[PDB]
Amino acid sequence: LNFKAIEEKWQKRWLEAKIFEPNIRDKPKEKKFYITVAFPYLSGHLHVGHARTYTIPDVIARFKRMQGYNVLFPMAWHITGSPIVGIAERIKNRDPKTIWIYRDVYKVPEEILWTFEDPINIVKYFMKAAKETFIRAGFSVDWSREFYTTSLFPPFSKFIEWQFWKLKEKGYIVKGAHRVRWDPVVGTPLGDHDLMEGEDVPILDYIIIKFELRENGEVIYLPAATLRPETVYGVTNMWVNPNATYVKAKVRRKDKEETWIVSKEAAYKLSFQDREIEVIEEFKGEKLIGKYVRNPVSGDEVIILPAEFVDPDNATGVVMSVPAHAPFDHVALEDLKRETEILEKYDIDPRIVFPAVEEVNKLGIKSQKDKEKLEQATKTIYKAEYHKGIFKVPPYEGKPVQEVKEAIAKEMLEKGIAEIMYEFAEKNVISRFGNRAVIKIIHDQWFIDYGNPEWKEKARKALERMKILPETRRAQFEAIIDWLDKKACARKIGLGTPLPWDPEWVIESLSDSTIYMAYYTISRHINKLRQEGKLDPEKLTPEFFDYIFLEEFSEDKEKELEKKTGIPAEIIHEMKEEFEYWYPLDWRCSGKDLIPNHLTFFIFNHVAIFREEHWPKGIAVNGFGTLEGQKMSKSKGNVLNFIDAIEENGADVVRLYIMSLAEHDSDFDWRRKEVGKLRKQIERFYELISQFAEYEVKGNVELKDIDRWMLHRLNKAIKETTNALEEFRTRTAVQWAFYSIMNDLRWYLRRTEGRDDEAKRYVLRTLADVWVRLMAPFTPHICEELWEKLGGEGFVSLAKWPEPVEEWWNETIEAEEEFIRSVMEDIKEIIEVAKIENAKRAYIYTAEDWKWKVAEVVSEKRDFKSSMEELMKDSEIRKHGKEVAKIVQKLIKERTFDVKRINEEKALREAKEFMEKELGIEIIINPTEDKGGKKKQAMPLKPAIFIE
RNA sequence: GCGGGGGUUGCCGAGCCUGGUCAAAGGCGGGGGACUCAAGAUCCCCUCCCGUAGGGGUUCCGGGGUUCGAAUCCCCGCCCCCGCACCA
Structure with missing residues (x-):
């Protein structure tokens, strides 16, 4: 009823024994079983959710270890990032919420907290807080191989470097433009987290089509922005806003210089949009009115009409009008007021492609002059003739709308007849400080082109050779290998490894964390050398890492690299001998949310660097976890820490309670009652074993059938379990290995109550032996203990896994047992539906x-x-x-x-008394006399019974 | 819009992939009992409708397709949850 004292007793034992620190020579390669999971991001305390992500790889690491495999399951810490950093400053500024998140939620000694201004202190207190909780939950982890990330772990960064350099040899590293939420303070990116409000506002690509106003001296553009590049061929006039103001200014790019007339604010946004905008003249709004402007794509010209619906803060302000479609084109057109010039109400109305010259939708509702109620009916038409929209215009026709809206915009952008202005869908996007969010273009912005189709096949070509779990995720993966372009593999803030060819740029998290799986493969010997200054980080070069990953074994490259690095040759040989042994990585675990990224980048980077025969062999993912229904939010506070939970329930309980709940990608819900109750059940299990533990290991007995049964179910549960596990199907396993055996046994007991012979002992005592070896992975502690209480041999953790035994199988007796059960059920019903009392009943088989x-x-x-x-x-x-x-x-x-032939005999054997004892009635099997039409008025598996 | 997966009995949640042995695993909630003045706790039993001899009827979103037979396989419809990029 405690185990806390025991838990520790064993973590120390396992530890010191260095039993979970595999040795390659120990066994041949086809026995090995490398297996990993994503190193957490030391930023706080892992909660029950993350708890699960880790148990699973352990449970299997243990399982397969007992199974006889040379298992390798390490763990390290991931810190390359920016949250920690930002967090630091926040507690510095003595932030009320962030401090509450560490003082109450993650509970940190009021004192220690304050020392957080230093990020390294946050990457310190929690690195420690993890390794302890992992070990306090007893993971088969080979700590021999352990390291943290960033430029702070020199040998790793060198590995990481080698990687990225090797990423140019293939040309997957590129530079280019790149939008990104931003804070106009003094400068700072908004990674969808700093925004003090509405961070879900999408990044629209309103492209501006530079219309021409070649009056006076010469040229000048009025770039109107439309999300429908197709409407160009339908321009019937221009739109601006008399009220709001605009401006004239030069707009320079790479070299090309132009002079534009757009919204003041539109200047603003664009000033960031990677173009120097030196103002020149402000307008008043209606000024632009009157002038005409030539439709760039076609050849015709049009007038600049005034409007009220044109939002200034939205795009350039200038909107190309095409009433033939966009229902918003007729709002101001419906002229009636008094402005100035006249005569045009009779301007032809062309139209691109339910009807034709649409307007049966605008007035097909109840719209008068200018109402935003149309802000919807305006995009209702956009869809209809979008998927279902044949093209008919002077130029090329036939193709669907989703084609010209990519034949025009592709052409204009190409001939510089149009440019793209990035702008939000709404205005509610504020920054962390208080400023209003804009968008900026990054020229440099390094990339990793997960686009290059020759690589995007190499990947897809691997995934099919891998294994997925669940398997119903095979899709999602492929599907992602497709819809994936180039990812910005670097930032400017936080910790991480600096780009070996642009120290200004700091390699972001999800980009460096993709092939570390193979660093562990040598992480040991490096901590060995690193341990006592016998390692010069520098000496670890691209040339270096290459021998120990690709370059086949040449006795000299070792000698050659010996001096170059300052490391013994035989130590190198071993290192590579390691990797060559341990890789490919049989499995890689993680949550499902990392499929649409890391899990994937994981396959890519791999196929890009490792000799194919080193490609991942499979991936297993898992669901999230909640807490009494409500989702665990670091901010609301309802979050159960892993450790904080191991403490109030005990590892073994917690551990199993998790697997207990779900498998594969299904989420789980942590409920207090549930866990408490599973706890009692654990104890009952515990005790029981302890009892049976007494029983002498005599053997050679004459077991009755009810014994052969409890022995059949053991065999059953043995097999079913072996399976669920072979397939990471925890919930199931636990249902067999635990809840099953439990039940089956409680019956056997209830079944053989008041009995106790050399046989009932054997069953019970041997059941114990197995049952114990089975739960070994879910509850490794109380088992290492009970394994001791029983005869015991070596650590339970290293004990071979129980596989079904030579027969000991009895589909037959299993069948007979349910039969008698059913009979009982029948009699019970026969009485429950009529009679009262009566000392007996009579029944015959067939x-x-x-x-x-x-x-x-x-x-x-x-x-x-x-x-x-x-x-x-x-x-x-x-x-x-x-x-x-x-x-x-x-x-x-x-x-x-x-054919449960001996049937009647079962109803006879060890059943007769039981049945009567339970039913509280006299049973009379196969009589002679004929009762209520008894005799052979019965069927197989359904004998005929008569009570009275 | 691109895309991934789905809808089950009072609820939560299996089972559908290897159709028939599913009235439908498990849990929770509800109820009766051993209890024995009295909180708790363990175990047993019932919980879709009906039933004065172990039975009968209707069930797995709507409608069809396929089959001797579908919660289970195919199609159309409605409906629901999830990622979209530098953010771990």
């Missing part, structure tokens, strides 16, 4: 011919006659004839099963 022989034949014609023909052609069977209607009935309930 016999071959008269019955059974029929059924074991019907079940081989499954028809109606062919059987009846097969039968009447037999004496002592046709002998009843008119009664062989047993075939009719028997037919309308599908075929048969086996």
Whole structure:
């Protein structure tokens, strides 16, 4: 009822024994079982959710270890990032919420907290807080191989470097433009986290089509922005806003210089949009009105009409009008007021492509002049003739709308007849400080082109050779290998490894964390050398890492690298001998949320660097976890820490309670009651073993059948379990290995109550041996203990895994047992529906011919006659004839099963007394006298009974 | 919009992939009992409708397709949850 004292007792034992620190020579390679999981991001305390992500790889690491495999399951810490950093400053500024998140939620000694201004202190207190919680939950972790990330772990960064350099040899590293939420303070990116409000506002690509106003001296553009590049061929006039103001200014890019007239604010946004915008003249709004402007794409010209619906803060302000479609084109058109010039109400109305010159939708509702109620009916039309929209215009036709909206915009952008202005869908996007968010273009912005189709095949070509779990995720993965472009593999803030060819740039997290799986492979010997200054980080070069990953074994490259690095040759050989042994990585665990990224980048980077025969061999993912329904939010506070939870329930309980709940990608919900109750059950299990532990290990006994049964179910549960596990199917496993055996055994007991012979002992004592070895992975502590209470040998953790035993199998007795069970059920019902008391009942089974022989034949014609023909052609069977209607009935309930022949004997053997004891009635098997029409007025598996 | 997966009995949640043995695993909630003045706790039993002899009827979102037979396989419809990029 405690185990806290025991838990520790063993973590120390396992630890010191260095039992979970595999040795390659220990076994051949086809025995190895490398397996990893994503190193957490030391930023706080892992909660129950992350708890699960880790148990699973352990549970399997243990399991397979007992299974006889040379298992390797390490763990390290991931810190390359920016949250920690930002967090630091925040507690510095003595932030009320962030401090509450560490003072109450993650509970940190009021004192220690304050020392957080230093990021390294946050990457210190929690690195420690992890390794301890992992070890306090008893993971088969080989700490020999352990390291943290960033430029702070020199040998790793060198590895990471080698990687990225090797990423240019293939040309997967590129530079280019790149939008990104931003804070106009003094400068700072907004990674979808700093925004003090609405961070879900999408990044629209309103492209501006530079219309021409070649009046006075010369040229000047009025770039209107439309999300429908197709409407160009339907321009019928321009739109601006008299009220709001605009400006004239030069706009320079790479070299090309132009002079634009757009919204003041539109200047602002663009000033960041990677273009120097030196102002020149402000307008008043209606100024632009009057002038005409030539439609760039076509050749025609148009007038600049004034409007009220044109939002200034939205895009350039200038909107190309095409009333033939966009229902917002007729709002100001419906002229009636008094402005100035006149005559144009009779301007032709062309149209691109329910009807034609649409307007049966605008007034097809209840719209008067200018109402935002149309802000919807304006994009309702956009969809209809979007998927269903044949093209008809002076230029090329036929193709669908989703084609010109990519034949025009592709052409204009190409001929510089249009440019793209990035702008939000809404205005509610504020920064961390308080400023209003804008968008900026990054020229440099390094990339990793997960686009290059020759690589995006190399990947897809691997994934099919891998293994997925669940398997119903195979799709999602492929699908992602497709819809994936180039990812910005670097930032400017936080910790991480600096780009070996642009120290200004800091390699971001999810980009460096993709092939470390192979660093562990040598992480040991490096901590060895690193341990006592016998390692010069520098000496660890691209040239270096290459020998120990690709370059086949050349005795000299070792000698050559010996001096170059300052490391013994034989130590290098071993290092590479390690990797070559441990890779490929049989499995890689992680949550499902990392499929649409890391899990994937993981396959890519891999196929890009490792000799194919080193490609991942499979991936297993898992669901999230909640807490009493409500989702765990670091901010709301309802979050159970892993450790904080191991403390109030105990590792073994917690551990199993998790697997207990779900498998694969299914989420789980942590409930207090549930866990408490599973706890009691654990104890009952605990105790029980302890008892059976007494029983002498005598053996050689004469077990009755009820014993062969509890022994059959053991065998059953043994097998079913072996499976669920082979397939990371925890919930199931636990249902077999635990809740099953439990139940089956409680019955066996209830079954053989008041009994206790050299045999009932054997069963019980041997059950114990197995049962214990089975839960070993879920609850490794109380088992290392109970394994001791029983005869015991070596650590339980290294104990071979129990596989079904030579027969000991009895589908038959298993069958007979449910039979008697069912009989009981029947009698119980017969009485529950009528009589009262009566000391007894009478019932008879059946016999071959008269019955059974029929059924074991019907079940081989499954028809109606062919059987009846097969039968009447037999004496002592046709002998009843008119009664062989047993075939009719028997037919309308599908075929048969086996023959629980000794049947009546089971109803007899060790059942007779039990049954009567439980039913509290006198049982009389196969009588002679004929009661209520008893005698052979019965069927197989359903004997006839008569109470009274 | 691109895309991934789905809808089950009072609820939560299996089972559908290897159709028939599913009235439908498990849990929770509800109820009766051993209890024995009295909180708790363990175990047993019932919980879709009906039933004065172990039975009968209707069930797995709507409608069809396929089959001797579908919660289970195919199609159309409606509906629901999830990622989209530098953010771990």
